[PDB]
Amino acid sequence: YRHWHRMSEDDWALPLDSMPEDVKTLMATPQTERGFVEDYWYNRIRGEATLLDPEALPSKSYIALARDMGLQIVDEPSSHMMGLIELYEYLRGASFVGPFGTIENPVLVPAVGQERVVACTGGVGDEEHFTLWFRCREGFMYRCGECDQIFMLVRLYYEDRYWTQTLVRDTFMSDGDMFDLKTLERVHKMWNKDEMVRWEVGYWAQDYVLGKGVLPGMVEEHTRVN
Amino acid sequence: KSYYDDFKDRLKPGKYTQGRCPQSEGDYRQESKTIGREHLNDDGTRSKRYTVKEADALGYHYHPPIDKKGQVYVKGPNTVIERGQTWIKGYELPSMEYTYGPKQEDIPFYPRVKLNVWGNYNLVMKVEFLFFYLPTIIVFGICIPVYTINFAQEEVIYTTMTVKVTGRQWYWVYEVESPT
Amino acid sequence: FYILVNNNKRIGIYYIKLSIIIGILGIVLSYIIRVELYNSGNRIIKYDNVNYYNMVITLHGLLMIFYIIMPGLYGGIPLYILPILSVITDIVLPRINNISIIIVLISYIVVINSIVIEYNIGTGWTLYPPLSIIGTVIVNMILYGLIIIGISSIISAINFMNILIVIDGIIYVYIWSIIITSVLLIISLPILNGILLMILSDIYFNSIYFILNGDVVLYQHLFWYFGHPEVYILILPAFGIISIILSVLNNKIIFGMKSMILAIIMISILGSIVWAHHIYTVGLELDTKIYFNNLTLIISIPTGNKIYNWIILYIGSYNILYNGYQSLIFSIMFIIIFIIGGITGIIISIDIIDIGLHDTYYIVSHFHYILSIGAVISLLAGILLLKDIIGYYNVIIKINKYFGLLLFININIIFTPQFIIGFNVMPRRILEYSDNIIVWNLISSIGSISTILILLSIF
Amino acid sequence: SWSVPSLGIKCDATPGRLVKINTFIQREGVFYGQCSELCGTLHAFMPIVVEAVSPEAFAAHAKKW
Amino acid sequence: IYEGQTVQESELIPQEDDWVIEETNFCLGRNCYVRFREEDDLARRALHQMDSQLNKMHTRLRDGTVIPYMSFHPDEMVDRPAPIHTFSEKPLLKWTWDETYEEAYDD
Amino acid sequence: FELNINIINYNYLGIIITVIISIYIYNNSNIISVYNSNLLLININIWMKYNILDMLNLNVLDYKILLWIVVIIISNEILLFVSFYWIYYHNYINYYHVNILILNSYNIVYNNIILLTLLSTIVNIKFYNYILSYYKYILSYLIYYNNYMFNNKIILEYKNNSNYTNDSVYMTSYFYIILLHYIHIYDSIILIVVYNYVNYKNINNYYININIYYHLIEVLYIVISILLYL
Amino acid sequence: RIGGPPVFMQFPPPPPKEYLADGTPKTYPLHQPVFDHGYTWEHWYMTNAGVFHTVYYGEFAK
Amino acid sequence: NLEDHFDLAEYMMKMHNPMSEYLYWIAGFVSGLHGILPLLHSNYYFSGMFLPRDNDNTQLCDDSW
Ligand SMILES: CCCCCCCCCCCCCCCCCC(=O)OC[C@H](COP(=O)([O-])OCC(O)COP(=O)([O-])OC[C@@H](COC(=O)CCCCCCCCCCCCCCCCC)OC(=O)CCCCCCCCCCCCCCCCC)OC(=O)CCCCCCCCCCCCCCCCC
Ligand code: HEA
Ligand code: HEA
Ligand code: CUA
Ligand SMILES: [O-][O-]
Ligand SMILES: [Cu+2]
Ligand SMILES: [K+]
Ligand SMILES: [Mg+2]
Ligand SMILES: [Zn+2]
């Protein structure tokens, strides 16, 4: 959005030193129990394990492929929530302009709390009036006293929580078959051999499953000076 | 009727000047020992420790509210499904008698009326023109007089005598040509 | 905390609180002046202590202008509502806002301390040289206060200008009023600082700008190049308040919003180019005098448009609404009073009329009707409108018809007679006067004691 | 500031400026004025008294004084 | 200049011959100084103040919609007295236009 | 969702700085004033640290806000110089026929204009490198040499001038205008001594501020040179 | 922005209420005096309650 | 917290200690004294009296008191 500042380096990828060292437990943790860093590396390890196995991709369904990469198959419930989330974020630093509100289609006023201050400017052209500010509280269909424009408050609330991308992913995504560490090892040997590492994440991940320091050059990789 | 008599009972006249006993009879300056009131004084005011000496904005009692999933507790709406539709019942504020005291009866009638706007665009535009140009005319009526009177002060006159006047602290010196 | 707070609304309260405190000292000085002027003779100041009177009038003027009305109308109400009117969480520069109020207090302490410790002499609030530069150290202390005050004013102006970058709604007329005052400060203050530094150079660095072959009239140009913009920096915030009160209380949308805004912009530009109407009697060139007289009379046009737009706001309002609220009465009283002050301003604007009326009590009454009556009442009306939002109590003002009536009557008893003695004529900045001017001076003095008594009834 | 209200004169006595003021008195009398620029402690104690007499009287006065 | 919303004669035609203008009182009620209970502490007096806000009040019309407390300026939209942090969720100024895009509709 | 602004709730530098200012007034020794100036520098630097630490908010409008403040400040610097030019020209009618020696139009103006121009070229190269995410170590030391020569030349001029401030308003205005320029030159030293390469690059308000200020001071000297020397 | 100042937070419940040893609710200082005198007048004023509403504000002698 | 919602919560909820108000009024009273006390001190310093007697700088009748 225009109100956001510049992408960080982390916005693209995370450093491999932030990979959890207990990979064996990481790949067995349920999604609802994974933190932001743990969830990043669960998806990256599992997603790259399937993508770096070309011979199996054509026989893998899009439902299974999306699960491996950690992408959520969309549906009307989740689409509604995500859309209203992105609409809330956009309105943080953007103007609020849209069609005239009526009983059939009230002006939708997203909010996290139970109230949001709103102003009615009336219709277009000569039907526009001076700003009339009012407090839009949930559970009431508001009508402007001047132009009769109907307003309504929409709350981004779900089960004692507000709506977030993390909440939407946890509520609607279902964990599939438990990730098999044999796949990690098999793909690891595929792209990492004879001092050539073409899957750096899988070389670090396999090292942790082995106990940290087992694979060649990994003790030297983990030895820091400050 | 007298509306004050309705809520007279709630208003019990006070005993202490400024509503506090002498500090000797009760030390309101100390923090309350009641569980869950460590941030309050005995008289109910916020304790200096909570607000000044150990203010959280200064790094004391560091306790991040947001949880691991980036969530905070949010209270949901009063939802009531009905007629094949999910409804939300809004929270209505309590009767103003509870909060203010007067009994909400015999309220004078103030009808709904849309904003009192001035109409007749053509007429309004002419008035606004007059609001600006009637003063402009008056100024123009003063302009010519102002020029003339200014010119009059600064007129080369055939003066025949000179008096020099010097102002000093605190008296006026006068120099005049003496008759020959 | 108390001093560390950065909350813009708390700081707004501090500005009003400090203006009232410093205002007590201001009013006391005014009572001294009026008591002295009750008859001819010495009443409360000895003839050997006439220097004290000169200091009383000097400090009265300086404190009321820079430490009371300006901190109240440009620092108090603005810091409390402007970020709300702009639908923004808080002021753009939080830390700067805190230091500004602290600076004002510190400069006030310096001034009053200089009363106690230094020899008491006066040179007017206009600090004309060479008199200002041949005085004692009290003049040096006053200069430090003004320069320090200037720092607070400029940084506060920078703070308000930044609202344009963050405003999330519509720039209402009141917001426009503050922005333009901020612009007027950014352009006028740097010139004031320069001339004040030159006063210091002559006082403290053996400079010779204000001794022969150096033109003393130079100071008056640079001073008044800030002086008159100052009187509009003090009135424009009041105009902004009047607009909000009339629209809100009458439930009527502002009429000619764009003309109101463009009238404020116009007053500022014109107010930046008319300063020499304060220098009519020095002996300027005929064409200069005519230019300044002409442009000074033009300021009435934009000022007149605003007055008439206010009148139509009150016209036609519903009768059922109670009209005795103190805020509404004060707002209406402002229109009635400001017209008197402005019209007399136009009279003095004619230079030939001004020759007779310069340095007379007619000028006093003119700027009192606008400031001591109009600006004060506007600040009161604005605070009164925000009583619920601010939340103060323990006063009987909100609905007090006695206070409004007594104030209006008695304030006019003080300054209406000062117009009369202007054609008598009684010079300004004097304490002794001829016995044939006692009647009017006595009447005004009776008015001053009475107004003070009415200030006690609010509690 | 040299001020004589009856003669319509109010001229600032500024150091460095020798301001010219022209006048034409029409009636005899004594016209009283006061300094009109705060000038220090005794700003209120330097009045301006001008007496206008007939030209024949002025000549006799000037010859003697 | 603003002169109200434009009305077409068709919109002024009633569906019944007995329709008149609804007589609903828009006086919110009788009020005075907010009166706190002595028993209430600082926290509970704060709740009391929050429940006495006129700008949270409205008038319900015959069709169930409510006309809220409205003001020309947002100064009257914060709790009285003003809290330390007022507009946490940015107040939304709603502008209206005739532009539309197809994605918003479904056939 | 987060708040649009991370509000700053408390600050104590303001009290200290305001007290430091009072010490300048309430003192009986000029040594106290010297050490007080150091205290001011320290606490103004803390305020600058607060500005750098506000970068953690990732607010897009912060750069714009600070940039426009500098614009206002530059404007105030320009208007202060205008007031001195005004003071100078008001008494113009009493210049050039008094028994004083005004300055030559050959030596001082040329070497100074040539010197200050080189200062601009260095700052311009710094800006160019700033655009190219590059650094050249020698640049800052060229500025130090330029400032040293400027200080060396101005000191000798004042000491060898045979007319004093009390001789004429012409001399007072000459000395004061030149001093005012020097003070702004010294403020440029205060700013430039911290120049370094920061890896956040063009979201750093320091770089744009330095470029604007240096150009202002050099341009101001062109106006002074025409008024006084030429 | 994950982990930034929340747009909205619910108030925590108020601290436990205090009773006296006899069960009387503990009262706290209150600057709303009931002045003693013989006057009982009640003045009511229609007041602006925004744009489309009013409130009947009453002032009581006590 | 609910106690922190309102700025100056104790005062707004009408629980503040009255001493805060007393200090504010005292501060204003002290500010006023800065105009009266130096008046008395300066009068005595240059005259020997704290305050004059009306018209004691002018000629008075024998029975004047
Ligand atoms: C123009 C006038 C008329 C106007 C009429 C129209 C008005 C319209 C309405 C205007 C409304 C504006 C907006 C209002 C918003 C109010 C918000 C508010 O209340 O904020 C809460 C704020 C604080 O409440 P809080 O939140 O509970 O604060 C708790 C504290 O922070 C913490 O509590 P704590 O207890 O820990 O506090 C610390 C406390 C600790 O305090 C203590 O321990 C005090 C101990 C007792 C001391 C008592 C004084 C002793 C004096 C002795 C003198 C001896 C002289 C001997 C002479 C001998 C001669 C032979 O204080 C300190 O430690 C520092 C105190 C510093 C400030 C006081 C300075 C006094 C003057 C000093 C002068 C020094 C001169 C030196 C010269 C040296 C030269 C060498 O309230 C106040 O500060 C009080 C405000 C009260 C008035 C509000 C407005 C009411 C409506 C207007 C009424 C009319 C007023 C007229 C002006 C005054 C006339 C006199
Ligand atoms: C906020 C305060 C304030 C305001 C608004 C004004 C406004 C004006 N003032 Fe000012 N003035 C002062 C404060 C103020 N003044 C002070 C403090 C001094 C003395 C300082 C000192 O000397 O120490 C002073 C001195 C002063 C003098 C000096 C007289 C002298 O030194 O002898 C003059 C003369 O030109 C003058 C003129 C004006 C004019 C022409 C206006 C105009 O703004 C007035 C405009 C308003 C109207 C004209 C009325 C409303 C308009 C209409 C009703 C439209 C119809 C009217 C017409 C068509 C004319 N003022
Ligand atoms: C806005 C500034 C202001 C204000 C309010 C006043 C108010 C008053 N002034 Fe004013 N006065 C000046 C500014 C002001 N004056 C100036 C600038 C001069 C010229 C200085 C000079 O000659 O060098 C002057 C000169 C001056 C003299 C001339 C003395 C002389 O030089 O010979 C006299 C007495 O005749 C006088 C009397 C009064 C009186 C009796 C009041 C008032 O007391 C009338 C009664 C009104 C009130 C008592 C209410 C005031 C209340 C407040 C100001 C507080 C408001 C705060 C809030 C609302 C939060 N004043
Ligand atoms: Cu001389 Cu006044
Ligand atoms: O000053 O008008
Ligand atoms: Cu003016
Ligand atoms: K007298
Ligand atoms: Mg004068
Ligand atoms: Zn509408």
Half-sphere exposure of C143 (CA within 13 A, CB side): 25
Closest-approach residue (CA) in chain F for B70: F1
Strand E92-96 with A96-98, pairing: parallel
Q: Which of C19, C123, C153, C344 is catalytic?
A: C153
| Helix%, strand%, coil% for chain A, nearest 5 | 40, 20, 40
Which H or E run includes D27?
A: none
Cα dihedral sign, G44-G46-G50-G52? positive
The reply to whether residue A131 touches residue C169, judged by beta carbons under 8 angstroms, is: yes
Nearest-CA residue for atom 48 of ligand 1: H23
Q: Residue F140: CB partners within 8 Å, gap ≥ 6?
A: F192, F195
| C-alpha of residue A65 to centroid of ligand 5, in Å | 79
Instruction: Give, in order, the Cα–Cα distances in Å from C231 to each of C112, C160, C185, C235.
Output: 24, 19, 11, 6
3-state class of A120 per DSSP?
strand
Please give the single-letter amino acid code of residue B64. Answer: P
d(CA C189, CA D33): 37
C56: left (phi over 0), alpha (psi -120 to 50) or beta: alpha
- Compute how many other C-beta atoms are within 10 angstroms of the C-beta atom of residue F137: 7
8 A C-beta contact, residue C189 and residue C154: yes
Residue G3 per-residue DSSP state? T
Strands (E), chain B: 78-82, 85-89, 163-168, 171-176
Nearest-CA residue for atom 70 of ligand 1: H27
Cis peptide before C125 (omega within 30 of 0): no
8 A C-beta contact, residue F83 and residue C191: yes
Work out the angle at residue C14's Cα, subtended by the Cα atoms of residues C11 and C20, and round it to the nearest 5 degrees: 150
DSSP H stretches of helix in A136-217:
165-172, 181-191, 200-210
Residue C27 Cα to chain centre, angstroms: 14
**Count of all residues that appear for chain E in the document:** 107
F3 close contact with G: CB closer than 8 A: yes
Task: Show contacts of D50-54: CB within 8 Å, 24+ apart.
Answer: D50/D4, D50/D7, D52/D25, D52/D27, D52/D28, D53/D28, D54/D28
The reply to whether residue A139 touches residue B73, judged by beta carbons under 8 angstroms, is: no
d(CA F102, CA A22): 83
Is C278 tagged catalytic?
yes
Q: Residue E2: CB partners within 8 Å, gap ≥ 6?
A: A126, A128, A129, A130, B117, C253
CB of C71 sitting under 6 A from ligand 3: no
Beta bridge partners of E96: A98
Q: Answer whether C touches D (≥3 Cβ pairs < 8 Å).
A: yes
Instruction: Provide the angle, in degrees to the nearest 10, between the axes of the packed helices C376-385 and C217-250.
Output: 30
Please give the single-letter amino acid code of residue E90. Answer: K
3-state class of C217 per DSSP?
helix
d(CA D58, CA D51): 10
Look at residues C13, C152, C175 and name the one whose alpha carbon lies nearest to residue C84.
C175
The reply to whether residue C190 touches residue F79, judged by beta carbons under 8 angstroms, is: yes
Instruction: Spell out which residues of chain B touch residue F9, defining contact as CB-CB under 8 Å.
Output: 57
Which H or E run includes A221?
A: helix A218-222
| C-alpha of residue H28 to centroid of ligand 1, in Å | 8
CB of C231 sitting under 6 A from ligand 5: yes
Q: Concatenated DSSP letters for C350-411?
A: SHHHHHHHTTBHHHHHHHIIIIIIIIHHHHHHHHHHTHHHH---S---TT-HHHHHHHHHHH
d(CA C68, CA C20): 7
Nearest-atom index, ligand 4, CA of D36: 2
Q: Which of C107, C243, C268, C448 is catalytic?
A: C243
d(CA G3, CA B168): 76
Cis peptide before C130 (omega within 30 of 0): yes
Q: Which residues of C2-41 are buried (b: 16+ CB within 10 A; e: fewer)?
A: eebbbbbbbbbbbbbbbbbbbbbbbbbbbbbbbebbbebb
| CA-based nearest distance C251→chain G, Å | 6
Q: Residue A61: CB partners within 8 Å, gap ≥ 6?
A: none
Which H or E run includes A151?
A: strand A150-155
CB of C354 sitting under 6 A from ligand 2: yes
d(CA A129, CA G51): 13
d(CA D4, CA D36): 10
d(CA C216, CA C209): 8
Q: Which residues of C426-447 are buried (b: 16+ CB within 10 A; e: fewer)?
A: bbbbbbbbeeebbebbebbbeb
Instruction: Give, in order, the Cα–Cα distances in Å from C447 to each of C25, C145, C432, F192.
Output: 19, 32, 19, 62
CB of C2 sitting under 6 A from ligand 1: yes
8 A C-beta contact, residue A31 and residue A170: yes
Which H or E run includes F192?
A: helix F169-192
Which of C392, C406, C407 should be mutated for ligand 1, with most atoms under 8 A from CB? Answer: C392
CB of D13 sitting under 6 A from ligand 4: no
The torsion of the CA quartet C85, C90, C92, C97, rounded to 10 degrees, works out to 110
Residue A33 per-residue DSSP state? G
Instruction: Spell out which residues of chain B touch residue D41, defining contact as CB-CB under 8 Å.
Output: 170
The reply to whether residue G12 touches residue H16, judged by beta carbons under 8 angstroms, is: no
The reply to whether residue G56 touches residue E30, judged by beta carbons under 8 angstroms, is: yes
Residue B94 per-residue DSSP state? P
Q: Residue B107: CB partners within 8 Å, gap ≥ 6?
A: E25, E27, E29, E30, G56
Which of C58, C64, C281, C303 should be mutated for ligand 2, with most atoms under 8 A from CB? Answer: C303
Instruction: Give, in order, the Cα–Cα distances in Å from A102 to each of A109, A155, B88, C431.
Output: 13, 19, 18, 72
Task: List strands edge to edge, sheet with G54-60.
Answer: E27-31, G54-60, G42-48
Look at residues C169, A133, B113, C246 and name the one whose alpha carbon lies nearest to residue E70.
A133
Nearest-atom index, ligand 4, CA of B167: 1
Please give the single-letter amino acid code of residue A103. Answer: I
Strand E27-31 with A161-162, pairing: unpaired
> How far from each other are the two terminal CA atoms of chain F, in whole angstroms?
63
d(CA C361, CA C430): 10
Which of C4, C14, C15, C20 should be mutated for ligand 1, with most atoms under 8 A from CB? Answer: C20
Closest partner residue to D8 (CB to CB) among C50, C355, C358 is C355
Instruction: Give, in order, the Cα–Cα distances in Å from A35 to each of A26, A40, G7.
Output: 10, 8, 22
CB of C357 sitting under 6 A from ligand 2: yes
Q: Residue D45: CB partners within 8 Å, gap ≥ 6?
A: B170, C432
Look at residues F112, F120, F191 and name the one whose alpha carbon lies nearest to residue F152.
F112
Instruction: Give, in order, the Cα–Cα distances in Å from F120 to each of A155, F81, F216.
Output: 57, 20, 10
The torsion of the CA quartet B133, B135, B139, B142, rounded to 10 degrees, works out to 120
DSSP H stretches of helix in C63-172:
70, 77-85, 94-117, 137-161, 163-166
Beta bridge partners of E83: H6
Write the burial class of residue G27 (CB in 10 Å: 0-12 exposed, 13-18 middle, 19+ buried): middle
> Within the 31-70 window of chain B, which residues sit less than 8 Å (CB to CB) from chain A?
68-70
Strands (E), chain D: 2-4, 9-11, 29-34, 47-52
Q: Residue A168: CB partners within 8 Å, gap ≥ 6?
A: A72, A78, A81, A82, A85
Instruction: Spell out which residues of chain A touch residue B68, defining contact as CB-CB under 8 Å.
Output: 35-36
8 A C-beta contact, residue C372 and residue C415: yes
d(CA C226, CA C297): 19
- Compute how many other C-beta atoms are within 10 angstroms of the C-beta atom of residue B1: 9
Q: Which residues of C370-399 are buried (b: 16+ CB within 10 A; e: fewer)?
A: bbbbbbbbbbbbbbbbbbbbbbbeeeebbb
d(CA F142, CA F124): 13
D7 close contact with C: CB closer than 8 A: no
Is C450 tagged catalytic?
no
Write the burial class of residue F7 (CB in 10 Å: 0-12 exposed, 13-18 middle, 19+ buried): middle
8 A C-beta contact, residue A184 and residue A209: yes
d(CA C302, CA A159): 59
CB of C228 sitting under 6 A from ligand 5: yes
Residue A55 per-residue DSSP state? G
Look at residues C337, C364, C378, C383 and name the one whose alpha carbon lies nearest to residue C448.
C364
Is C125 tagged catalytic?
yes
Instruction: Spell out which residues of chain G touch residue F6, defining contact as CB-CB under 8 Å.
Output: 4-5
Half-sphere exposure of C321 (CA within 13 A, CB side): 21
Residue reference for tokens 């209270």: B75
d(CA E58, CA E70): 9
Beta bridge partners of D32: D49
d(CA C124, CA H35): 16
**Count of all residues that appear for chain H in the document:** 65
d(CA F98, CA F119): 36
Q: Which residues of C347-361 are buried (b: 16+ CB within 10 A; e: fewer)?
A: ebbbbbbbbbbbbbb
Residue reference for tokens 């849309």: B114
Instruction: Spell out which residues of chain F touch residue G9, defining contact as CB-CB under 8 Å.
Output: none
Is C398 tagged catalytic?
no
The reply to whether residue C32 touches residue H49, judged by beta carbons under 8 angstroms, is: no
Residue E35 Cα to chain centre, angstroms: 24
Residue reference for tokens 């002074």: F224
Which H or E run includes D44?
A: none
8 A C-beta contact, residue B72 and residue C18: no
Work out the angle at residue A150's Cα, subtended by the Cα atoms of residues A145 and A151, and round it to the nearest 5 degrees: 105
d(CA F188, CA F66): 18
DSSP H stretches of helix in chain B:
48, 96-100, 121-153
Q: What are phi and psi of C27, to 5 degrees?
A: -65, -40
Closest-approach residue (CA) in chain A for B114: A146
Please give the single-letter amino acid code of residue B75. Answer: K
Which H or E run includes C14?
A: helix C8-36
G46 close contact with C: CB closer than 8 A: yes
Strands (E), A15-106: 96-98
The tokens describing B123, both together, are 């007429």
Which H or E run includes F103?
A: none
Is C153 tagged catalytic?
yes
> Within the 60-99 window of chain F, which residues sit less than 8 Å (CB to CB) from chain E?
none
Beta bridge partners of B167: B172
When computed from its CA atoms, the radius of gyration of chain F, rounded to whole angstroms, is: 21
d(CA A48, CA E62): 61
d(CA F119, CA F144): 10
Instruction: Spell out which residues of chain G touch residue C324, defining contact as CB-CB under 8 Å.
Output: 45
F193 close contact with A: CB closer than 8 A: no
Nearest-CA residue for atom 2 of ligand 5: C228
Is C247 tagged catalytic?
no
d(CA F16, CA C106): 12
Closest partner residue to A145 (CB to CB) among G2, G8, G52 is G52
d(CA F146, CA F126): 15
H18 close contact with B: CB closer than 8 A: yes
Q: What are phi and psi of A131, to 5 degrees?
A: -60, 125
CB of D43 sitting under 6 A from ligand 4: yes
Which H or E run includes E14?
A: none
8 A C-beta contact, residue E67 and residue B112: yes
The reply to whether residue G10 touches residue B14, judged by beta carbons under 8 angstroms, is: no
D23 close contact with C: CB closer than 8 A: no
Which of H4, H15, H17, H24 should be mutated for ligand 1, with most atoms under 8 A from CB? Answer: H24
Closest partner residue to B77 (CB to CB) among A145, A155, A166 is A155
d(CA C443, CA C439): 6
d(CA H62, CA H65): 9
d(CA C162, CA C86): 11
Mapping DSSP onto H, E and C, the string for C299-331 reads CHHHHHHHHHHHHHHHCCCCCCCCCCCHHHHHH
The torsion of the CA quartet A168, A174, A178, A179, rounded to 10 degrees, works out to -50
CB of C367 sitting under 6 A from ligand 2: yes
Cα dihedral sign, A214-A219-A220-A221? positive
The tokens describing F213, both together, are 């200020």
3-state class of A101 per DSSP?
coil
Mapping DSSP onto H, E and C, the string for H14-25 reads CCCCHHHHHHHH
Q: Concatenated DSSP letters for F12-74?
A: -HHHHHHHHHHHHHS-S-HHHHHHHHHHHHHHHHHHHHHHHHGGGG--THHHHHHHHHHHHHH
Closest partner residue to F91 (CB to CB) among C5, C103, C215 is C215
The tokens describing C346, both together, are 């136009």
d(CA B118, CA C316): 9
